Amino acid sequence: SNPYQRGPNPTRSALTADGPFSVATYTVSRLSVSGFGGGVIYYPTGTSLTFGGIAMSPGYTADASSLAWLGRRLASHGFVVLVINTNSRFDGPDSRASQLSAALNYLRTSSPSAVRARLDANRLAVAGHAMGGGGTLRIAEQNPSLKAAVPLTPWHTDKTFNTSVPVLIVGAEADTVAPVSQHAIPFYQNLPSTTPKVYVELCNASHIAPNSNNAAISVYTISWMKLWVDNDTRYRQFLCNVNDPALCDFRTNNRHCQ
Numbered sequence: 001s002n003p004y005q006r007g008p009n010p011t012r013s014a015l016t017a018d019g020p021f022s023v024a025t026y027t028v029s030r031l032s033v034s035g036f037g038g039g040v041i042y043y044p045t046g047t048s049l050t051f052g053g054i055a056m057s058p059g060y061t062a063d064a065s066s067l068a069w070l071g072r073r074l075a076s077h078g079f080v081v082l083v084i085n086t087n088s089r090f091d092g093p094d095s096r097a098s099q100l101s102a103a104l105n106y107l108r109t110s111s112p113s114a115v116r117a118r119l120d121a122n123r124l125a126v127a128g129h130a131m132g133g134g135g136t137l138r139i140a141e142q143n144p145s146l147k148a149a150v151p152l153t154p155w156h157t158d159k160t161f162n163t164s165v166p167v168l169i170v171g172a173e174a175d176t177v178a179p180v181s182q183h184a185i186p187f188y189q190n191l192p193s194t195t196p197k198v199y200v201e202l203c204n205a206s207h208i209a210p211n212s213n214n215a216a217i218s219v220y221t222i223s224w225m226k227l228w229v230d231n232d233t234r235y236r237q238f239l240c241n242v243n244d245p246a247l248c249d250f251r252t253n254n255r256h257c258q
C-alpha cells in the first residue's frame with residue numbers, strides 16, 4: 001500500500017538502537033567534489049530496496065565524525081545519509097546551507113552506483129547540528145521539494161525562516177552555545193503557523209548532546225524522517241500525544257498527527 005514503507009512496526013526501544021538494515025559506508029573525498037568538503041555516506045546493504053536520502057551538516061569547528069553515530073543510526077533504519085565535512089571548519093550557517101545544497105545535488109547526480117542503487121532521489125531531507133541546524137533552516141526556505149528538516153540544537157543569526165517543509169527542532173535545556181531562548185525557540189515560533197512543526201527540548205542536555213548516542217534525538221529524528229520522507233504514518237505514535245520524561249518542553253501546531 002505505501003511503496004516507501006520500510007522495516008517492522010516500530011517500538012520506542014527499537015528507535016533507540018541501530019535498526020533492521022545492515023549499513024555500508026562510502027568516504028567522499030574533499031578533492032572528489034565541489035561545493036562541500038566531502039564526508040561519509042551511510043547506506044543500507046544486504047538489500048535490493050531504495051530509501052530516501054538525508055544530507056546532514058555538523059556545526060562550527062566540527063567535522064562529520066561528530067554526527068557519525070546519527071548517520072549510521074538513520075541509515076540502519078532505512079535511509080541513505082551523507083554527513084558532510086565543510087570547506088572550512090569555521091564556515092557559518094548560510095555557508096553550511098550552500099554545502100547541504102551541493103551534497104544533495106551530489107547524492108542525486110554523482111554519488112557512486114552503490115549509493116544510487118539504494119537511493120530514491122525523489123525523497124530527500126536535511127538535518128544538522130548547531131550552525132549545521134541553521135543551514136538546515138536556510139535550505140528548507142530555498143528548496144520546497146525537501147520532505148523534512150531536523151535542526152539539532154540549532155544556531156543562526158537569522159531567526160526568521162519561511163518554509164512549508166515540515167520542521168522538528170531539538171533544543172537542549174542547558175545549551176550555553178545556542179541557548180534555546182535565543183535560537184531553537186525563536187526558530188520554532190517564527191516558522192509559519194501553517195507549516196507542520198515540532199519543538200522538543202531535552203532535559204539537562206548540553207550543546208554536545210547531538211554528538212553522542214542519544215535516545216530522544218534517535219526517536220524524534222527517525223520518526224520525523226520516517227513520517228515525511230517515507231509517508232510512514234506508523235511513526236505518528238512517537239510524535240503525537242507525546243508524554244516523554246526526557247523532555248522539559250514540547251511545542252507543536254499538531255499538523256502532522258492526521
Ligand SMILES: O=C(O)c1ccc(C(=O)OCCO)cc1
Pocket residue numbers: 058059060061062066129130131132155177178
Ligand atoms: O561560539 C559560538 O558562537 C558558536 C560556537 C559553536 C557553534 C556551533 O555550530 O556549535 C557546534 C559545533 O559542533 C555555534 C556558535
Ligand SMILES: [Ca+2]
Pocket residue numbers: 158159160161
Ligand atoms: Ca530571515
